[PDB]
């Protein structure tokens, strides 16, 4: 926080805001309040970094507050501020809750419109493209996890991946490491004496999904 | 914070170039209009994206 | 575009008084000004230069 | 076998293959608005559609955006190549086979196809190939004495990222020693790739030697 | 020569270009480099406009053995006259960080080249002094205390920076720091007051040790430095004089103006408190009005 | 930074009238109508005539 | 060579209205009629030799 | 965009013309692109 | 192709900056003709240690304004001091226009493009530089054949991918058909940093100085009197303000050049001065005696 | 060549001893500063 205010250069400003949500990965709820002040900032760079931090923070364990914070950052006028917000929204609202949420359908098509628009800059279009890519990743059946829910321990692959993904402004081929952050969500039955998947049906309250189709 | 951004905003637009003012004499069907600038010649010039 | 100009004054481009180093007046010998002397430190053989409006 | 992680990948690969939703309308709407004869536009789509078919080997993309492929250029062409590894992730039996014609020694059309093919090889066999690292290991040390040649530098740029993913969390001093020579040269793009790859390798170690070096 | 040369104005280009000359020749660790300083002169204000390296060589066996190249100097003057007709020879920089006695001899070369006493400009590029990055010195001849001869000496002058217009624009732009001192808000000047006090003490300390060394370690007695201290002591305010007593009364009067000014802001604050307690009062009314309105919309569905 | 802009050189014009509360229209001593952003920290009640 | 670059074409045509010539040491310093110390020059920093065109 | 107005003084038959424009110096302009030599008459107003 | 054709990030040192501005502001009206001397590395990074104004000319900018005698003369003497560097492009002033290359400037550019294809042409307009980056920009020829076949963007990787241009006009017309534009960055060390900020030992000197008390007492009275007068305006304002519409309040009882606000700033200003005046005085009294 | 040409005005009317309104001979009225190379004890209204 101290470096984000005190060090006036744009790289240093942007990095330190991104860096907070890795520290407070598990305390993802309080982050919306702390970078509330940096969302509103008169410094474009700082707001760019605000948007990535919130994406990373609430990616696998959702939270409403961030989705709301990230909406004015979409609509923020600076080119790259917008670019950052679009990519970030799809990290958070990667398939979890989307049956209790009309929001997923609305954000998805917000990406569509930006691509259709010619009047938008290339940078807004870039942000829509990649963001539409993530949303429908995996065949619409993977999620971005941040930790294993079976041991309470941060996954090596996801967290390290994220850092390589976040920087792509300065070298563009450094943007395919979010592949490692995908983990399939699915319970797979294995047979104990034939090691193959059985067909078995379980009662489940479930879960219409067609909110990114 | 709002007070610093706005002063920078006042400053920003002064660095941007000036503006003018004419009156439309006639309408063109090329998606243009014919404007006559008040101390200056006629120009057929593209129109704003909001009209 | 090419601008439209028109000649309004004729000069002869030697004897003009273009170099002004060791010459005098506004006019030279009316055909020479830098070919009889190299105390100007220059020679030029340009004539009928013409002054447009 | 389970502790190797090899059958563990294959059980997710069964998931991804059966249950894929490829949406062709998203794909097609990207072809028209964001072009190929713009480098930035090409880059955005290549990444997007890589994420989208991620983890499920498919050639549907390749065949779809076949006239779009020939519009690639420059470093956009590199990214386009890198994106296939994201598509072809998993499937460890068939994993090599699919990067095989885009692999050097059996390619010669562009330096980007040959370079990003080696980045693409590393994404698939990340954590599942300790043999993988060595094959790529040859190319690192190979090009480190001939690195004043720009074409060659591009081939090496991609191998250094690829070997980085492969040896991630294995901590091999061999691999380290190889990327340290590309770095001590001061290679134009490949020193950048090699410095990142040293950190991936020696992930969590905290050893002073890597730290001072 | 010339007599008027009293204050030296120094462009921000000069400190940076000398800095660059030192490190682009790989002369370091007290291998000195001599370059010329060009500008205008013949007048009180001395502008150094531009600076450039010359070839130089130095010996560590006897230190009064050196090479200076004159031929390069001749070519430089020809070239730069066309660049700006505002560059003529005004002396030479010596790269520092210290003044030598060997710079006394090198000076006789530059005194011959240009008819003015030539400026010696020390550009401290090793920056071990917290002030003075530039020191200005003009060699002059004067008769010297303690019965001694007309000796050659270097007399310090003002070494000021005031900057050119041209220079100001790049200087502020590169700047992104809150500056060493700027003297803007109250925060900057509260820092400054405390900085000044440390400043006064540091100069004064060196003086203590000079007087100690005259009477213990036999450095020669220079009556100019003793005389300045006399003058210091005669402009020292004495308590219980009418001058000092007045200072005390004036402090009461300025603090009366401050007392009132602090109270005149409570008034400004007090306006705000009331405007916020009014705002809060409206948010209350708004909240009740909605809770009533949910009933009307509930009723409309049953109704139709 | 604003204060620099305010100092000289300046060209005289004459304020006519507002069209907004933050943009006005002037005509210069050049003989050109220019529609101009008005600066904050000046009159907008005694600016109107 | 520097002067010839100028004398080479095109160049503006004008007329001279009047000439105003002052000399060095106009008060004590300068060829201008202002008050400042030093800079005795012909026209370079202390202007007084001039044509109004 | 924009187009400066002209006024056509006269046509020289060789794929040029002379205009006098509210721009202070006159121009030898060319007749070219979606215009004909006989789609113009002298003294008619043209678009430059 | 045979080059990466990616527009270079231009790092012109702070020493170089100062030079470049000085030479163009001097020569107004006039175009000043120089060369950039640095060292090109990578495929995207130029570092400009110093620049040279080659002698001013009356032909403007052309290939017939390069002077190879004068060029060489500069070069030969850098070698002899060991400060040798090579050209990475050239620079020039527009004395009262925006930043673009003309067709005629493109051909000057072309001479250096033979030498290395990462030649930059930098345009300075110093009547509009009240800031150090503004109205300066660097341009670089792209291959003519890349244009025909539409490989023209490919500067969008190996860079930030942000690109701030200035103006409609000549800029967009030459951008399209000749050159690719990218921002000039400005680079500096910490030895240079201390040099600018510092203002000798006469910087601390100002901070123990006291002033004539006629001017201090005068300063106080002026401010004091001022707050009586706009504080009758304040009385009117907070007598009313019981009526809805925020804008309507600002016309009627004022809120445009708001009296409460103007008073508060002036009151604070003189209050801060006089805290200083007593501190700096009491410091000297104790300190010096 | 390095002297550089100059423009003439006449002081149209005093506005401050800092700032003065000049009427340019080139055209438009301007408010211009003063330098330390001119005496403002000898700038007065209607001085060229």
Swiss-Prot record, chain B:
It is found in: Cytoplasm; Nucleus. Disulfide bonds: none annotated. N-acetylated by NAT1. Belongs to the AAA ATPase family. Present with 4700 molecules/cell in log phase SD medium. The 26S proteasome is involved in the ATP-dependent degradation of ubiquitinated proteins. The regulatory (or ATPase) complex confers ATP dependency and substrate specificity to the 26S complex. May form a homodimer or a heterodimer with a related family member. Interacts with OLA1, TMA17, and UBR1. This is 26S proteasome regulatory subunit 8 homolog. The lineage of its organism: Eukaryota, Fungi, Dikarya, Ascomycota, Saccharomycotina. The gene is RPT6. The chain holds residues 52 to 102 of 405 of the full protein.
Swiss-Prot record, chain F:
Coiled coil: none annotated. It is found in: Cytoplasm; Nucleus. N-acetylated by NAT3. It comes from the Eukaryota. Belongs to the AAA ATPase family. The 26S proteasome is involved in the ATP-dependent degradation of ubiquitinated proteins. The regulatory (or ATPase) complex confers ATP dependency and substrate specificity to the 26S complex. This is 26S proteasome regulatory subunit 6B homolog. It comes from Saccharomyces cerevisiae (strain ATCC 204508 / S288c) (Baker's yeast). The lineage of its organism: Eukaryota, Fungi, Dikarya, Ascomycota, Saccharomycotina. The gene is RPT3. The chain holds residues 85 to 133 of 428 of the full protein.
Swiss-Prot record, chain I:
It holds the Pfam family RPN11_C. GO terms for molecular function: cysteine-type deubiquitinase activity; metal ion binding; metal-dependent deubiquitinase activity; metallopeptidase activity; proteasome binding. It catalyses: Thiol-dependent hydrolysis of ester, thioester, amide, peptide and isopeptide bonds formed by the C-terminal Gly of ubiquitin (a 76-residue protein attached to proteins as an intracellular targeting signal). Residues 10-145 form the MPN domain. Keywords: Acetylation, Hydrolase, Metal-binding, Metalloprotease, Protease, Proteasome, Thiol protease, Ubl conjugation pathway, Zinc. A motif (JAMM motif) lies at residues 92-105. Present with 16400 molecules/cell in log phase SD medium. Component of the lid subcomplex of the 26S proteasome, a multiprotein complex involved in the ATP-dependent degradation of ubiquitinated proteins. RPN11 is the only catalytically active member of the lid and serves as the essential deubiquitinase of the proteasome. The JAMM motif is required for the deubiquitination and degradation of ubiquitinated substrates. This is Ubiquitin carboxyl-terminal hydrolase RPN11.
From Swiss-Prot, chain J:
It comes from the Eukaryota. N-acetylated by NAT1. The 26S proteasome is involved in the ATP-dependent degradation of ubiquitinated proteins. The regulatory (or ATPase) complex confers ATP dependency and substrate specificity to the 26S complex. Belongs to the AAA ATPase family. This is 26S proteasome subunit RPT4. It comes from Saccharomyces cerevisiae (strain ATCC 204508 / S288c) (Baker's yeast). The gene is RPT4. The chain holds residues 98 to 145 of 437 of the full protein.
């Amino acid at each position: 926080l101290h470096v984000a205010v005190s060090d006036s250069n744009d790289d240093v400003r942007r990095a330190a805001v991104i860096a907070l949500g890795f520290v407070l990965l598990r305390d993802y709820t309080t982050v919306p309040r702390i970078v509330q002040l940096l969302s509103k900032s008169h410094n474009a760079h700082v707001r760019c970094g605000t948007a990535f931090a919130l994406g990373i923070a609430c990616a696998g364990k959702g939270l409403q507050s961030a989705i709301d914070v990230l909406d004015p950052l979409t609509k923020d006028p600076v080119d790259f501020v917008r670019q950052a917000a679009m990519i970030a929204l799809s990290m958070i609202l990667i398939q979890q809750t989307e049956k209790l949420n009309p929001q997923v359908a609305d954000i998805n098509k917000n990406f569509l419109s930006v691509i259709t628009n010619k009047h938008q800059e290339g940078l807004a279009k870039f942000g829509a493209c990649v963001a539409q890519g993530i949303m429908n990743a995996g065949g619409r059946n993977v999620t971005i996890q941040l930790e294993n829910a079976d041991t309470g321990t941060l996954d090596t692959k996801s967290v390290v991946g994220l850092v390589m993904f976040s920087q792509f402004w300065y070298w563009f081929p450094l943007a395919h490491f979010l592949s490692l952050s995908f983990t399939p969500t699915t319970v797979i039955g294995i047979r104990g004496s034939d090691q193959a998947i059985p067909k078995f049906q379980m009662n489940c309250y479930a879960k219409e999904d067609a909110f990114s189709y | 914070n709002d007070k610093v951004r706005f002063i920078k905003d006042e400053l920003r637009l002064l660095q941007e170039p000036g503006s003018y003012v004419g009156e439309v004499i006639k309408i063109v069907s090329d998606k243009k209009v014919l404007v006559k600038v008040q101390p200056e010649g006629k120009y057929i010039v593209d129109v704003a994206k909001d009209i | 575009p090419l601008q439209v100009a028109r000649c309004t004054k004729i000069i002869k481009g030697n004897g003009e008084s273009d170099e002004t180093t060791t010459d005098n007046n506004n006019s030279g010998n009316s055909n020479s000004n830098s070919n009889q002397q190299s105390t100007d430190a220059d020679e030029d053989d340009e004539d009928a230069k013409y002054v447009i409006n | 076998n389970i502790l190797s992680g090899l059958p563990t990948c294959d059980y997710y690969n069964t998931f991804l293959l059966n249950n894929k939703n490829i949406d062709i309308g998203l794909l097609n709407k990207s072809k028209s608005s964001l072009d190929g004869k713009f480098s930035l536009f090409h880059t955005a789509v290549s990444v997007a559609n890589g994420f989208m078919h991620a983890g499920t080997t498919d050639n549907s993309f390749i065949k779809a955006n076949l006239p779009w492929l020939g519009k690639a250029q420059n470093w956009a062409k590199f990214t386009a190549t890198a994106s296939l590894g994201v598509i072809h992730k998993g499937n460890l039996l068939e994993g090599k086979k699919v990067m095989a014609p885009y692999l050097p020694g059996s390619r010669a059309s562009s330096r980007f196809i040959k370079g990003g093919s080696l980045y693409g090889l590393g994404l698939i066999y990340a954590g599942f190939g300790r043999d993988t690292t060595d094959y790529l290991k040859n190319i690192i040390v190979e090009n480190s004495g001939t690195s004043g040649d720009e074409d060659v530098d591009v081939l090496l740029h991609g191998a250094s990222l690829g070997i980085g993913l492969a040896a991630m969390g294995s901590a091999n001093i061999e691999v380290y020693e190889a990327l340290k020579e590309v770095l001590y040269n001061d290679s134009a793009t490949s020193g950048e790739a090699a410095a990142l790859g040293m950190g991936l390798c020696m992930l969590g170690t905290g050893k002073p030697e890597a730290i001072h070096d | 020569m010339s007599l008027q040369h009293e204050k030296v104005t120094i462009a921000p280009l000069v400190l940076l270009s000398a800095l660059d000359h030192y490190e682009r020749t790989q002369t370091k660790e007290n291998k000195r480099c001599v370059g010329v300083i060009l500008g205008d002169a013949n007048s009180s204000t001395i502008r150094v406009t531009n600076s450039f390296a010359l070839p130089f060589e130095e010996d560590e066996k006897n230190s009064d053995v050196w090479f200076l190249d004159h031929n390069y100097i001749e070519n430089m003057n020809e070239m730069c006259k066309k660049i700006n007709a505002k560059e003529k020879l005004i002396g030479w920089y010596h790269s520092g960080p210290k003044l030598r006695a060997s710079d006394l001899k090198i000076n006789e070369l530059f005194k011959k080249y240009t008819q003015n006493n030539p400026l010696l400009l020390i550009v401290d590029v090793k920056q071990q002094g917290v002030g003075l990055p530039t020191d200005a010195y003009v060699a002059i001849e004067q008769v010297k205390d303690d019965g001694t001869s007309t000796e050659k000496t270097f007399l310090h002058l003002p070494c000021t920076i005031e900057a050119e217009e041209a220079e100001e624009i790049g200087v502020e732009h590169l700047l992104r720091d809150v500056r060493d001192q700027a003297a803007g808000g109250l925060s900057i000047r509260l820092t400054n007051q405390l900085k000044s006090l440390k400043g006064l003490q540091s100069k004064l300390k060196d003086v203590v040790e000079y007087l100690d060394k005259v009477i213990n370690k036999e450095l020669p007695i220079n009556h100019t430095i003793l005389g300045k201290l006399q003058d210091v002591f005669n402009l020292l305010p004495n308590l219980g004089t009418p001058d000092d007593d007045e200072i005390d009364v004036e402090n009461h009067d300025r603090i009366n103006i401050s007392n009132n000014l602090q109270k005149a802001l409570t008034v400004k604050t007090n306006d705000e408190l009331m405007v916020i307690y009014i705002s809060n009062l409206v948010r209350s009314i708004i909240a009740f009005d909605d809770l009533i309105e949910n009933k009307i919309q509930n009723k409309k569905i049953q109704e139709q | 930074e604003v204060k620099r802009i305010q100092s000289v050189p300046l060209v005289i014009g004459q304020f006519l009238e507002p069209i907004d509360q933050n943009t006005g229209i002037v005509s210069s001593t050049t003989g050109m109508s220019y529609v101009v952003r008005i600066l904050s920290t000046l009159d907008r009640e005694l600016l109107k005539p | 060579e520097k002067i010839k670059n100028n004398r080479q074409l095109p160049y503006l045509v004008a007329n001279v209205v009047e000439v105003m010539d002052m000399n060095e040491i106009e008060d004590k310093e300068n060829s201008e009629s202002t008050t400042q110390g030093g800079n005795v020059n012909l026209d370079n920093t202390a202007v007084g030799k001039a044509a109004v065109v | 965009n924009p187009l400066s107005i002209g006024t056509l003084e006269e046509i020289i038959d060789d794929d040029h013309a002379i205009v006098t424009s509210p721009t202070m110096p006159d121009y030898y302009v060319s007749i070219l692109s979606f215009v004909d030599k006989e789609l113009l008459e002298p003294g008619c107003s043209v678009l430059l | 192709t045979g080059r990466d054709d990616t527009k270079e990030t231009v790092y012109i040192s702070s020493i170089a900056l100062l030079k470049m501005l000085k030479h163009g502001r001097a020569g107004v009206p006039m175009e000043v003709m120089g060369l950039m001397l640095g060292e090109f590395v990578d495929d995207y990074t130029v570092n400009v240690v110093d620049v040279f104004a080659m002698p001013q000319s009356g032909t403007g900018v052309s290939v017939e304004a390069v002077d190879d005698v004068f060029q060489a003369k500069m070069m030969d003497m850098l070698k002899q001091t060991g400060r040798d560097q090579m050209v990475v492009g050239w620079y020039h002033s527009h004395p009262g226009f925006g930043c673009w290359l003309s067709s005629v400037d493109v051909n000057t550019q072309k001479s250096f493009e033979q030498l290395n294809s990462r030649a930059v042409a930098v345009v300075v307009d110093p009547i509009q530089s009240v800031k150090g980056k503004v109205v300066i920009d660097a341009f670089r020829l792209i291959d003519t054949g890349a244009l025909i076949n539409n490989l023209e963007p490919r500067q969008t990787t190996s860079n930030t991918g942000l690109l701030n241009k200035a103006n409609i006009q000549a800029l967009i017309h030459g951008l399209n058909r000749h050159y690719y534009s990218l921002n000039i960055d400005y680079h500096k060390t910490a030895k240079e940093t201390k040099m600018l900020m510092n203002l000798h030992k006469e910087q601390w000197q100002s901070g123990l100085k006291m002033y004539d008390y006629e001017e201090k007492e005068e300063s106080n009275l002026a401010a004091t009197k001022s707050m009586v007068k706009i504080a009758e305006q304040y009385s009117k304002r907070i007598e009313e303000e019981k009526e809805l519409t925020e804008e309507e309040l600002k016309t009627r009882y004022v809120g445009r050049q708001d009296p409460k606000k103007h008073l508060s700033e002036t009151a604070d200003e003189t209050l801060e001065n006089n805290i200083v005046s007593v501190l700096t005085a009491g410091v000297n009294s104790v300190a010096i005696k | 060549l390095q002297s550089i040409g100059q423009l003439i005005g006449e002081v149209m009317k005093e506005l401050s001893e800092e700032k003065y309104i000049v009427k340019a001979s080139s055209g438009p009225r301007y408010i211009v500063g003063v330098r330390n190379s001119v005496d403002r004890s000898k700038l007065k209204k209607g001085v060229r």
